[PDB]
From a paper:
Biochemical data suggest that stimulated GTP hydrolysis powers DNA translocation, allowing EcMcrBC complexes bound to distant RMC sites to interact and induce cleavage on both strands. Here, we present cryo-EM structures of an [name] hexamer and [name] complexes from the evolutionarily distant archaeal species [name] (Tg) and the well-characterized E. coli system.
To overcome this limitation, we produced complexes containing full-length TgMcrC bound to the [name]+ domain of TgMcrB (TgMcrBAAAC) in the presence of GTPγS. This assembly was structurally more homogeneous and allowed us to calculate maps of the “half”-complex at 3.7-Å resolution, as well as a C2-symmetrized map of the entire TgMcrBAAAC tetradecameric complex at 4.2-Å resolution. In support of this notion, we find GDP at the A/B site in our EcMcrBC structure, the F/A site in the structure of the TgMcrBC complex, and at both sites in the structure of the TgMcrBAAAC complex. The loose A/B and F/A sites represent low-affinity, post-hydrolysis states that allow for free exchange of GTP and GDP, consistent with [name] not requiring a guanine nucleotide exchange factor.
Author numbering:
A (entry chain G): 5 to 98, 107 to 280, 290 to 328, 335 to 380, 393 to 453
B (entry chain F), C (entry chain E): 193 to 584
D (entry chain D): 194 to 584
E (entry chain A): 400 to 471
F (entry chain C): 543 to 584
G (entry chain A), H (entry chain B), I (entry chain C): 258 to 328
Write the structure that this text describes.
């Protein structure tokens, strides 16, 4: 069964496909698996409460008696033929669930640091496939591999001190001089032969073999079927985490960086990955600000310690003199005013940095939308200047029209 | 319609110089290449005018052109004389056999005929005549460089070389000196005559315009990720399609009677009439079965993974069709789809069927995470024919 | 011929010392390396003035400049001697031929002539004269140590080493010592005369300024491409783009009658007039056909996987264009886009077409999970030109 | 000028063996060849210094010692162990250092007999090779009975200037030398090591004369000296690609160093004609290499920078055109193979698509919305206007 | 010669039949020797062990197998 | 980590990459300014 | 088929080509099959000499090995 | 087993087949097994001679190596 | 321990077995160990003859290696 969630959204167990007992068995393994692998991913003002909440089967999904509720952890996971995918709530609409997939991967393209191509994703737009995050990241792995295997096969050179019936390469002399004449019929050479089954090819044969076994499309089954035939002579391996560390990216296999990072993102039971929606917006806004703020340079994660260090998500300073704090919040900001938890942190970030502070918030049809300019000016009775900026999201499309509107509102703010 | 396939090879082999009969296995690519050379140069065996040679994964350049090899010398201790491979024993042979018919006033025809004897010698070279072989080979490449390009295009004996399974070996490593030479222009006598200096023996070497290197590439193994520049431009690729037109009643009768004898063709007529009467009196059954199963292969997987037509070409009864479907089609079908079951039953259009007359029946015990494993099921008699009559 | 690709090789090889003609397959890279050296040295065969070798993955460092190679003597069969490769037999040949017209070798001009005989000797070196060869070699590097740099700047011959497919071998390993000699001011006579010490023989070695190295690498493959940044400085890369301008009506008559200067110029001209008259009297058809494929390959594939102008150069008739399409470049296009059918339909500009006069017909049978693949169609006649007029 | 010369001379007395590492295209082999020539007054290799260079087939058996068949009699091929390139230097640098000592090494007839059999270019006959192998056993019986004060100060400085030290498998080539390449583990040091060789079994120790100045490139990161125990031995001199030499005056000072005022007047008016076409600015090629090396530092790494061996041999604007389109733009395209919006940014033509751009945009597009550019060969003064926009 | 038949034997716990070399899945013809549990009955285990032993060993083999399956 | 200019071994290059990357360069110091860049480690 | 060393009456090592397993069973299947052929009776004495030599073990001297290579 | 040179005559260095450890221990187990067997009494006075040659803790002498070969 | 060819002045290549670094320390520690005590190590001149033939700087002659193998 395929189940899909948006951030802070619920599904009924009666309407859902499959079995009632089957889905709740899949989740308790996933929330437990998120507990052991929680510390690998960074957060930003998450209020995670690592001791109590995550180990109570509330790590990724809150499984309840009457419904199934998603926390603010975005991504996907495939467990026990119950494929779960959690999209952001910002891309929620009012092919009907194919626009938020390419919106989320493009927000996973710019924020998280991936180097995927837009024409890789635009190939899938309109082919009426079943929307699934695991079916597209296997495709993004398989297409970027088959576009990097079609040119060259990555045959890397190792040297072997082999006793050959012929003579290839440099003849070892200290091993041939001390050769008895009863065994003179084989040369003892040290040939730098190119092997096809290197460590990077043992991984990509194993990463395809664990992908074709767990794929469900008709496009990925054809593409991984051609990749497995190209890797036919390679002896297979069992994938571990030691194999993904033992290879290093030099200049002669640098073009295999794009399929390998996606092969490390999906393989290392469980499959997939999860990230916090607060930090992914904190990373995504950081791409927008430094591009859109020419007058003043901006650094993310600068920290100033009170008295326990409370650090802004981003601060922009021209040289050192202007202190314009920019704290990225994923909150909906209901009733056109910041909440108690938000404005209390905005007060501290301005005071310990005469410092204006701007809060960027999400804006679409689903999320709360303010007017086009800088919506809310606030003073906290200390000559402060709190500006509520809102970035519109044309990221569901491929054109960046809202970046010009975000620059025009920031130019009036700067 | 096989003389056009002996003309499709023949029109490309005088224009590009060498071909590759690429196609799915069980088609006749080895048989078309072998029965074209035997029909052209009337020599039923290898050796003199053509040499059959297959490739493998551990085949190296030193076995093909030349390499240092230990060789015994008159039942005594070994020496380390450099041995010419299987190509250089026929590339030099195609030169010195063509240089008989050339009437020039500089040919050492007594010396060239002595070199031709030492090249066709089936025994290995003894050191009393190996130095006579290397000295006469030195006279050959002093003579070839002195002949003009006008007298090195019309060499009469067409030498051949059936490279079987050319994609199985590493093609760019075997053809070391033969991905700069195997063009029609880079041969001897052409406009771009190149005599390439070899690394091991140190003597210059150039392919003559007689040698045509026919290749028979299986493409269900070590697929189309080829060299794509060197081993793809030189070879004029001929697709040998798996033709189900040879699987009718008359076409199976015509194939198995021409190679047959007097008493064999009457028994092959009685056997094939018994076979197709058990199938439903369908004279076009095995054609329609192979054509239907080939369309399902080219839709799901690649178009060059189709089941060929050399398998069903040697059937005479239902029991022989059973032993070619369960040992040369269904193990071959489970090889292409990498032990998949939900798409291997759509090829037989048995996607929504289980436990009946199906070639892959579902086991009635699912796994822990809801997975299911199918199992091959042997059939017999009219149950198997009813399992074949719903593939169409 | 002398306009661009000759006058920019000769200017750049005389300035840098080494030229690599990198470019996609089907372009005149081996040809412009062969034509430039033969038109310079006036020797249409290898040997004395120039040597044409080619690299591969079985090529050794020990067989290039210096290595231990076991020879076959008479009474001691296994005798391990150090044998100079092909580069040390062309670098020492370029040195002792250039040192015939010097004025500081006045004690051993007979010794330099005797050393030149031992290097031009194609017979294998007997061990009674190999020590005479080694005594003259260590006399040579004593003589260039006492030679001034003003007299080693101008050596009047011009020796060449056309290595072909340089990028195939392990170029960091084959050029062992040559990764610090191959520069214009690091040969003999340059501003930094470097005489390095070879490992095996223990004799010093330095590339003369007489020598030039014209590599022709291929850049369609990527796992063998030359990314050694310390080696790309030594060479001087010349991109030979595949020019479709050699496929016009006036250009095919000028390229094919320059080489074939026989009395068949009336035969080629009336055949090339008949070929383009069947193409709609379009004198720029094959120029437009190769241009509208190479641009459409550049945008989706890499820019170095383009179709060269050596496929469509040897066309004569529509029957010959049909043979070079369906058997050389259409299996090549199915190798670039291997079961990526929406791309290969678009490269031939048949994206919306799925029936009729088209190369790839759509199958009328879709798959289980919504996949769909196409099928070749062997066209002929004016319908084939109607399938080529849609590309341009 | 003499700063890189003196910096090599300081570290070759402190650590013992210097390594000039840097991006390819700078003066690494040149400042290593000019150092050894100006310090030993010997322009060709020989006794006082020997140039070698490493590769993957430069194994241990031919560098220090290994078995080598050698008979010099055309009969009775004697399978004897012969010393490599290094041990023929370190034994030569020792027995040349045992001349100037007064009375510590009492071998004044037996050391000079060993030196004349070590510098002998003709290969050793077996009637004198038994003398060479017997005197070498006397040498390591002599060394060991000398005080460290009469062994630390050996006068004549020997140099084994090697090249591409990273290119060979350096932990395999350096065998017994992996523990002897410190300044205090040599002969005469505080902790001398008479280490034993495997094959011949005769002991061995490096003299304090022999300095190993070894140049390497660090753009190939596939083969860089990452062994952390062969970075303690060597002293790593940074040789960055310095664009200060590509001025008008600094290019006139370098290129007119050895011409004897014959072609120097031709070179002076040729550089006057080059910079008159670049815009009458003496500082063009300095900031051209600077704005490329900075823009290639922030993208690829610090180590893939364009050197100054490319642009140093330009004379006219035509020779700059033939070093741009044929040496560095094919180099810039193979850093970024089919990575087009990056290589457009190194030339900072990122908004520029058509016109005087090196990479014009193809008028076609893709089926999935992709695009790719095409290299545009520019000529004339339009090439300089396409080049001055980089600065 | 056409006499020489090549009867292979393949322990496929480590290497599957799809993981062979490509000139082994087409030149040869594969027979799956399935693990038959029907050789482990009470009467089938007696008949298999009756071929190797003698007559007096068979009554001891009969009594031991009767002692085995009574405990199970 | 916060020092990007002045007495520091690695100055920051003034421009960033096209997609948010930024590299440094090894600044050679001398004298007491080197010690002032060394005593801030401890 | 391969190379294998062999002593010649306590002398230096003499290399000789000794057939492996597959060639010793393929040649044995040939010379045993030519007994019951009516056309191969032109050399029935010499073929039978080969079959006795091909089933015995350790050919000790070259006088029967050169007989073996002649047959 | 493999080939080793021996201390034969001066100009007559010979390559014999000196047995290793596994052949020597399996022969020694076979010789000691047949030494106490009842039906192998045809040459039991020579099997004890072969046992002394196999427990000989030194390289075998060339004047009696053929006695080891014949036994 | 390994094999090593050794042609001295005019003899043939007699393939001697040369002890490596470790056995020339292990035998040298054992022989210098037994040289100081006297419980049952008879032949103190014989043990001293083995110690001289272990600290030889020159390679061993075949008239001296054979007595070194016996000791
Ligand atoms: N006359 C003439 N012929 C040309 C020209 N360019 C290519 N050709 C022809 O192309 C043919 C082969 O081109 P070639 O140079 O050999 O490709 P290549 O460099 O070897 O291709 P690769 O596989 O190594 S990558 C030759 O027959 C030659 O006649 C040209 O500019 N003029
Ligand atoms: N006068 C002068 N010439 C220089 C200087 N730097 C480089 N050159 C010149 O540039 C040329 C190339 O420099 P070179 O030393 O050979 O580069 P490299 O470091 O050795 O190149 P690599 O492949 O080993 S990494 C030399 O001929 C040298 O004359 C310099 O600072 N002063
Ligand atoms: N008579 C006849 N037999 C054919 C034809 N095509 C194939 N065969 C048969 O196919 C068999 C050879 O198959 P082969 O070429 O080895 O298949 P492949 O090499 O794996 O592609 C032979 O036994 C032929 O009898 C044909 O056109 N006519
Ligand atoms: Mg075949
Ligand atoms: Mg070529
Ligand atoms: Mg260098």
């Amino acid at each position: 069964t395929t189940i899909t969630l948006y951030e802070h959204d619920e599904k009924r167990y009666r309407d859902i496909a499959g079995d009632k007992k089957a889905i709740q068995d899949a989740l308790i393994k996933l929330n437990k698996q998120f507990k052991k692998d929680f510390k690998k991913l960074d957060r930003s003002e998450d209020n995670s409460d690592t001791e109590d909440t995550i180990d109570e089967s509330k790590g990724v999904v809150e499984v309840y008696a009457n419904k199934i509720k998603a926390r603010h952890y975005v991504g996907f996971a495939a467990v026990d033929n119950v494929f779960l995918q959690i999209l952001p709530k910002v891309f929620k609409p009012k092919e009907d669930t194919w626009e938020p997939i390419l919106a989320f991967i493009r927000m996973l393209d710019m924020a998280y640091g991936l180097k995927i191509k837009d024409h890789d994703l635009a190939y899938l737009q309109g082919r009426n496939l079943r929307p699934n995050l695991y079916e597209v990241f296997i495709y993004l792995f398989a297409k970027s591999l088959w576009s990097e295997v079609q040119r060259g096969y990555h045959r890397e050179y190792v040297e072997v001190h082999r006793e050959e019936k012929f003579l290839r390469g440099k003849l070892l002399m200290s091993r041939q001089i001390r050769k008895l004449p009863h065994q003179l019929n084989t040369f003892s050479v040290e040939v730098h032969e190119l092997i096809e089954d290197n460590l990077l090819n043992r991984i990509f044969y194993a990463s395809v073999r664990e992908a074709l076994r767990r794929t469900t499309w008709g496009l990925n089954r054809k593409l991984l079927g051609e990749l497995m035939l190209a890797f036919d002579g390679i002896t297979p391996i069992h994938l571990r985490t030691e194999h993904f560390e033992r290879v290093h990216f030099t200049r002669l296999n640098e073009r295999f960086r794009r399929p390998f990072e996606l092969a490390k993102l999906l393989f290392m039971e469980v499959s997939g990955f999860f990230v916090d929606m607060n930090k992914l917006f904190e990373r995504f806004i950081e791409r927008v600000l430094v591009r859109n703020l020419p007058p003043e340079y901006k650094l993310f994660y600068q920290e100033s310690y009170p008295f326990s260090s409370q650090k802004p998500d981003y601060v922009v300073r021209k040289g050192n003199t202007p202190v314009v704090v920019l704290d990225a919040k994923y909150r909906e900001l209901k009733e056109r005013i910041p909440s108690s938890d938000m404005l209390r942190q905005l007060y501290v970030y301005s005071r310990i940095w005469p410092a204006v502070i701007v809060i960027p918030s999400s804006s679409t049809y689903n999320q709360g939308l303010p007017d086009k300019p800088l919506e809310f000016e606030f003073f906290d009775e200390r000559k402060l200047f709190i500006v509520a900026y809102n970035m519109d999201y044309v990221k569901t499309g491929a054109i960046f029209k809202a970046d010009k509107n975000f620059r025009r509102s920031l130019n009036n703010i700067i | 319609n096989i003389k056009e396939d002996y003309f499709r090879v023949d029109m490309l082999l005088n224009k590009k110089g060498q071909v590759i009969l690429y196609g799915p296995p069980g088609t006749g690519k080895t048989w078309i290449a072998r029965k074209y050379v035997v029909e052209e140069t009337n020599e039923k065996t290898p050796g003199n005018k053509w040499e059959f040679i297959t490739f493998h994964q551990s085949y190296s350049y030193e076995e093909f052109i030349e390499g240092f090899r230990p060789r015994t010398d008159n039942e005594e201790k070994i020496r380390y004389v450099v041995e010419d491979g299987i190509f250089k024993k026929i590339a030099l042979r195609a030169l010195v056999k063509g240089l008989f018919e050339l009437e020039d006033a500089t040919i050492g025809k007594d010396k060239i005929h002595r070199l031709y004897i030492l090249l066709t010698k089936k025994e290995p070279l003894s050191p009393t005549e190996y130095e006579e072989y290397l000295r006469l080979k030195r006279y050959l490449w002093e003579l070839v460089g002195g002949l003009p390009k006008d007298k090195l295009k019309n060499l009469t004996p067409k030498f051949y070389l059936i490279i079987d399974e050319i994609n199985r070996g590493n093609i760019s490593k075997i053809f070391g000196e033969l991905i700069t030479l195997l063009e029609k222009d880079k041969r001897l006598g052409g406009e771009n005559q190149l005599i390439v200096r070899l690394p091991y023996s140190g003597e210059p070497f150039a392919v003559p315009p007689n040698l045509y290197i026919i290749g028979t590439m299986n493409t269900a193994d070590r697929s189309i990720a080829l060299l794509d520049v060197a081993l793809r431009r030189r070879f004029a690729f001929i697709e040998v399609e798996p033709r189900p037109e040879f699987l009718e009643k008359e076409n199976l009768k015509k194939i198995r009677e021409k190679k047959l004898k007097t008493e064999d063709r009457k028994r092959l007529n009685e056997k094939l009439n018994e076979l197709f009467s058990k199938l439903g009196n369908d004279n076009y059954f095995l054609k329609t079965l192979l054509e239907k199963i080939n369309v399902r292969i080219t839709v799901v997987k690649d178009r060059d993974h189709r089941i060929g037509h050399s398998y069903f070409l040697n059937v005479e009864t239902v029991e022989d069709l059973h032993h070619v479907w369960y040992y040369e089609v269904l193990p071959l079908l489970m090889e292409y789809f990498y032990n998949d079951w939900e798409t291997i039953k759509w090829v037989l259009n048995e996607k929504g069927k289980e436990h009946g007359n199906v070639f892959f029946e579902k086991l009635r015990l699912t796994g822990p995470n809801g997975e299911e494993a199918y199992q091959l099921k042997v059939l017999e008699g009219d149950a198997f024919i009813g399992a074949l009559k719903r593939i169409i």
